[PDB]
Amino acid sequence: ASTDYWQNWTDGGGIVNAVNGSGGNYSVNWSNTGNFVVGKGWTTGSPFRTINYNAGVWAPNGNGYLTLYGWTRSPLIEYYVVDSWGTYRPTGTYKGTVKCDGGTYDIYTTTRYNAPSIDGDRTTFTQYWSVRQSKRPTGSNATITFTCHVNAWKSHGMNLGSNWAYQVMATEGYQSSGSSNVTVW
């Protein structure tokens, strides 16, 4: 499918060279950054979406996530389906596991306090995570069946909000350097 949303947010730290490529392709070269999130996807997320991507380059030199990323409002929730990472595997309060698209994912919840949200300014909000137990190999055509994650999250009392915001296949980094090149459809 054609992506219609370009996400390019940085807290201003370091260098984040994000390139909005043709179609669903984007690339990012980053160095000594604060926190940033770059990715392509859809303006309005859906619990029924099947996301396809191929990360031709996944080269983080530190803390970075290759992840499906999105938000819902009412309530405010930042969610993640992490397929690969750099030096740090994100974790939180363990809820259980789910097998989706050939991989096994741990389900976690965490809370952010006085942190920047989608609306701007800062607030306290919950984060939902599905984190692969081992890094998914990159360079191949991968699929993330979001319904598989949404249903598993629901079984653990992790219900998404009623107002859907953007949904993208992103590269997120935190105080690190690296490069990525991803195509989304």
mmCIF file of C-alpha atoms in Angstrom:
data_model
loop_
_atom_site.group_PDB
_atom_site.id
_atom_site.type_symbol
_atom_site.label_atom_id
_atom_site.label_comp_id
_atom_site.label_asym_id
_atom_site.label_seq_id
_atom_site.Cartn_x
_atom_site.Cartn_y
_atom_site.Cartn_z
ATOM 1 C CA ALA A 1 0.000 0.000 0.000
ATOM 2 C CA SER A 2 1.112 3.582 -0.391
ATOM 3 C CA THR A 3 2.230 5.282 2.756
ATOM 4 C CA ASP A 4 0.821 8.765 3.262
ATOM 5 C CA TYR A 5 2.582 9.877 6.410
ATOM 6 C CA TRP A 6 6.141 11.014 7.048
ATOM 7 C CA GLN A 7 7.274 11.099 10.675
ATOM 8 C CA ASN A 8 10.406 13.132 11.405
ATOM 9 C CA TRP A 9 10.722 14.211 15.021
ATOM 10 C CA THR A 10 13.828 15.091 17.001
ATOM 11 C CA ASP A 11 14.279 16.729 20.393
ATOM 12 C CA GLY A 12 17.032 18.776 18.760
ATOM 13 C CA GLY A 13 20.075 16.905 19.999
ATOM 14 C CA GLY A 14 22.932 16.015 17.689
ATOM 15 C CA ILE A 15 22.595 15.239 14.017
ATOM 16 C CA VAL A 16 19.624 13.471 12.445
ATOM 17 C CA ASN A 17 19.817 13.420 8.643
ATOM 18 C CA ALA A 18 16.423 11.998 7.646
ATOM 19 C CA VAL A 19 15.664 11.498 3.959
ATOM 20 C CA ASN A 20 12.098 11.221 2.676
ATOM 21 C CA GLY A 21 12.718 8.896 -0.276
ATOM 22 C CA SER A 22 10.537 7.739 -3.156
ATOM 23 C CA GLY A 23 7.453 5.738 -2.290
ATOM 24 C CA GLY A 24 7.700 4.091 1.100
ATOM 25 C CA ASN A 25 11.480 4.406 1.321
ATOM 26 C CA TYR A 26 13.361 6.540 3.835
ATOM 27 C CA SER A 27 16.869 6.650 5.267
ATOM 28 C CA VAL A 28 18.426 8.140 8.390
ATOM 29 C CA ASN A 29 22.052 8.841 9.309
ATOM 30 C CA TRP A 30 22.319 9.979 12.913
ATOM 31 C CA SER A 31 25.113 10.932 15.302
ATOM 32 C CA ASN A 32 25.378 11.804 18.997
ATOM 33 C CA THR A 33 21.684 12.434 19.283
ATOM 34 C CA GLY A 34 19.142 13.025 21.986
ATOM 35 C CA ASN A 35 15.856 11.202 21.194
ATOM 36 C CA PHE A 36 14.379 11.083 17.681
ATOM 37 C CA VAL A 37 11.817 9.037 15.729
ATOM 38 C CA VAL A 38 11.787 8.828 11.922
ATOM 39 C CA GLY A 39 9.566 6.646 9.773
ATOM 40 C CA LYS A 40 6.960 6.254 7.071
ATOM 41 C CA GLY A 41 3.461 4.920 7.369
ATOM 42 C CA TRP A 42 -0.134 6.016 7.659
ATOM 43 C CA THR A 43 -1.810 9.157 9.009
ATOM 44 C CA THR A 44 -4.556 7.119 10.652
ATOM 45 C CA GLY A 45 -3.542 3.865 12.255
ATOM 46 C CA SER A 46 -5.681 0.750 12.244
ATOM 47 C CA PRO A 47 -5.783 -2.353 14.491
ATOM 48 C CA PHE A 48 -6.333 -4.381 11.281
ATOM 49 C CA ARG A 49 -3.280 -3.230 9.351
ATOM 50 C CA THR A 50 -0.664 -5.613 8.016
ATOM 51 C CA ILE A 51 2.628 -3.759 7.677
ATOM 52 C CA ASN A 52 5.347 -4.871 5.257
ATOM 53 C CA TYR A 53 8.890 -3.576 5.316
ATOM 54 C CA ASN A 54 12.400 -4.332 4.171
ATOM 55 C CA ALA A 55 15.273 -2.750 6.078
ATOM 56 C CA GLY A 56 18.099 -2.679 3.532
ATOM 57 C CA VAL A 57 20.364 -1.096 6.132
ATOM 58 C CA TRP A 58 20.031 -1.546 9.884
ATOM 59 C CA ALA A 59 23.298 -0.297 11.410
ATOM 60 C CA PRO A 60 22.814 1.242 14.844
ATOM 61 C CA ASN A 61 26.027 2.034 16.753
ATOM 62 C CA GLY A 62 24.289 2.180 20.105
ATOM 63 C CA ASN A 63 20.709 2.462 21.339
ATOM 64 C CA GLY A 64 18.272 2.347 18.417
ATOM 65 C CA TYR A 65 15.010 0.503 17.620
ATOM 66 C CA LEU A 66 13.637 -0.789 14.299
ATOM 67 C CA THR A 67 9.991 -0.841 15.278
ATOM 68 C CA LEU A 68 6.343 -0.361 14.302
ATOM 69 C CA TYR A 69 5.390 2.813 16.166
ATOM 70 C CA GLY A 70 2.164 4.647 16.790
ATOM 71 C CA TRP A 71 -0.186 6.472 19.103
ATOM 72 C CA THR A 72 -3.801 6.422 20.193
ATOM 73 C CA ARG A 73 -5.614 9.145 22.132
ATOM 74 C CA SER A 74 -8.357 8.498 24.703
ATOM 75 C CA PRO A 75 -6.382 7.247 26.331
ATOM 76 C CA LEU A 76 -2.965 8.498 25.265
ATOM 77 C CA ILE A 77 -0.824 5.438 24.475
ATOM 78 C CA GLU A 78 2.476 5.147 22.604
ATOM 79 C CA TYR A 79 2.876 1.638 21.262
ATOM 80 C CA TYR A 80 5.666 -0.438 19.768
ATOM 81 C CA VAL A 81 6.320 -3.714 17.922
ATOM 82 C CA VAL A 82 10.085 -4.003 18.055
ATOM 83 C CA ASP A 83 11.739 -6.286 15.498
ATOM 84 C CA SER A 84 15.355 -5.275 15.977
ATOM 85 C CA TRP A 85 17.480 -3.053 18.164
ATOM 86 C CA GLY A 86 21.032 -1.955 18.772
ATOM 87 C CA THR A 87 22.909 -2.333 22.005
ATOM 88 C CA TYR A 88 19.848 -2.245 24.276
ATOM 89 C CA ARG A 89 16.832 -4.537 24.186
ATOM 90 C CA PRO A 90 13.851 -2.601 25.527
ATOM 91 C CA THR A 91 11.937 -4.247 28.370
ATOM 92 C CA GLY A 92 9.444 -3.333 31.066
ATOM 93 C CA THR A 93 6.771 -4.998 33.161
ATOM 94 C CA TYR A 94 6.371 -8.501 31.720
ATOM 95 C CA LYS A 95 2.840 -9.483 30.674
ATOM 96 C CA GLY A 96 3.335 -12.575 28.551
ATOM 97 C CA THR A 97 4.383 -13.633 25.047
ATOM 98 C CA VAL A 98 2.814 -13.942 21.606
ATOM 99 C CA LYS A 99 3.952 -15.607 18.382
ATOM 100 C CA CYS A 100 3.358 -13.481 15.304
ATOM 101 C CA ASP A 101 4.868 -13.644 11.828
ATOM 102 C CA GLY A 102 7.303 -16.445 12.667
ATOM 103 C CA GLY A 103 8.761 -14.757 15.739
ATOM 104 C CA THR A 104 8.097 -14.898 19.472
ATOM 105 C CA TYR A 105 7.579 -11.566 21.226
ATOM 106 C CA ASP A 106 7.551 -10.626 24.894
ATOM 107 C CA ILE A 107 4.782 -8.210 25.882
ATOM 108 C CA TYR A 108 5.645 -5.345 28.250
ATOM 109 C CA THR A 109 4.140 -2.173 29.634
ATOM 110 C CA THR A 110 6.020 0.877 30.884
ATOM 111 C CA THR A 111 5.006 4.409 31.899
ATOM 112 C CA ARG A 112 6.662 7.669 30.865
ATOM 113 C CA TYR A 113 6.602 10.591 33.304
ATOM 114 C CA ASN A 114 6.642 14.231 32.205
ATOM 115 C CA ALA A 115 7.777 13.219 28.730
ATOM 116 C CA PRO A 116 7.019 14.786 25.312
ATOM 117 C CA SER A 117 3.876 13.319 23.759
ATOM 118 C CA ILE A 118 2.206 13.484 20.348
ATOM 119 C CA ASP A 119 0.265 16.614 21.390
ATOM 120 C CA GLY A 120 3.434 18.509 22.255
ATOM 121 C CA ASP A 121 4.374 19.723 25.741
ATOM 122 C CA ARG A 122 4.895 16.991 28.386
ATOM 123 C CA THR A 123 2.692 14.567 30.250
ATOM 124 C CA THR A 124 2.510 11.091 31.799
ATOM 125 C CA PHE A 125 1.417 8.188 29.563
ATOM 126 C CA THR A 126 1.529 4.418 29.152
ATOM 127 C CA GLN A 127 3.557 2.546 26.515
ATOM 128 C CA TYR A 128 2.620 -0.892 25.137
ATOM 129 C CA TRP A 129 5.387 -3.089 23.759
ATOM 130 C CA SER A 130 5.803 -6.325 21.841
ATOM 131 C CA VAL A 131 9.575 -6.958 21.682
ATOM 132 C CA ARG A 132 10.998 -9.830 19.667
ATOM 133 C CA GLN A 133 12.952 -12.286 21.827
ATOM 134 C CA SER A 134 15.811 -12.290 19.300
ATOM 135 C CA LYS A 135 16.562 -9.758 16.550
ATOM 136 C CA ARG A 136 14.724 -10.340 13.311
ATOM 137 C CA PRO A 137 17.190 -10.599 10.422
ATOM 138 C CA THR A 138 17.102 -7.566 8.134
ATOM 139 C CA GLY A 139 17.457 -7.178 4.385
ATOM 140 C CA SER A 140 14.407 -9.355 3.675
ATOM 141 C CA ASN A 141 10.710 -8.637 3.108
ATOM 142 C CA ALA A 142 9.175 -8.783 6.570
ATOM 143 C CA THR A 143 5.587 -8.635 7.750
ATOM 144 C CA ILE A 144 4.076 -7.411 11.008
ATOM 145 C CA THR A 145 0.474 -8.615 11.361
ATOM 146 C CA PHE A 146 -0.672 -5.946 13.793
ATOM 147 C CA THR A 147 -3.942 -7.707 14.658
ATOM 148 C CA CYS A 148 -1.858 -10.540 16.145
ATOM 149 C CA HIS A 149 -0.315 -8.073 18.596
ATOM 150 C CA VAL A 150 -3.509 -6.108 19.300
ATOM 151 C CA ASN A 151 -5.407 -9.287 20.219
ATOM 152 C CA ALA A 152 -2.611 -10.524 22.501
ATOM 153 C CA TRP A 153 -2.390 -7.128 24.198
ATOM 154 C CA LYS A 154 -6.145 -7.163 24.771
ATOM 155 C CA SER A 155 -5.930 -10.581 26.462
ATOM 156 C CA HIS A 156 -3.616 -8.908 29.003
ATOM 157 C CA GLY A 157 -5.832 -5.909 29.678
ATOM 158 C CA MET A 158 -3.780 -3.659 27.391
ATOM 159 C CA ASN A 159 -6.517 -1.862 25.502
ATOM 160 C CA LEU A 160 -5.727 0.786 22.920
ATOM 161 C CA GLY A 161 -7.416 4.185 22.763
ATOM 162 C CA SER A 162 -10.434 5.001 20.646
ATOM 163 C CA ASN A 163 -8.898 7.857 18.641
ATOM 164 C CA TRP A 164 -6.172 6.554 16.310
ATOM 165 C CA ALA A 165 -3.207 8.744 15.409
ATOM 166 C CA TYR A 166 -0.353 7.906 13.001
ATOM 167 C CA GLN A 167 1.180 4.433 12.600
ATOM 168 C CA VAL A 168 4.645 4.059 11.056
ATOM 169 C CA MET A 169 7.589 1.668 10.614
ATOM 170 C CA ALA A 170 10.241 3.649 12.407
ATOM 171 C CA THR A 171 13.814 4.051 13.420
ATOM 172 C CA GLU A 172 14.019 5.511 16.950
ATOM 173 C CA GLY A 173 17.321 6.397 18.599
ATOM 174 C CA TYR A 174 18.442 7.625 22.002
ATOM 175 C CA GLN A 175 21.891 9.148 22.603
ATOM 176 C CA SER A 176 23.514 7.123 19.833
ATOM 177 C CA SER A 177 24.759 7.074 16.230
ATOM 178 C CA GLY A 178 23.907 4.889 13.264
ATOM 179 C CA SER A 179 22.284 4.444 9.865
ATOM 180 C CA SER A 180 19.119 2.829 8.552
ATOM 181 C CA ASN A 181 17.406 2.491 5.188
ATOM 182 C CA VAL A 182 13.877 1.119 5.247
ATOM 183 C CA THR A 183 11.105 0.648 2.702
ATOM 184 C CA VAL A 184 7.528 0.375 3.923
ATOM 185 C CA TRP A 185 4.339 -0.823 2.217
#
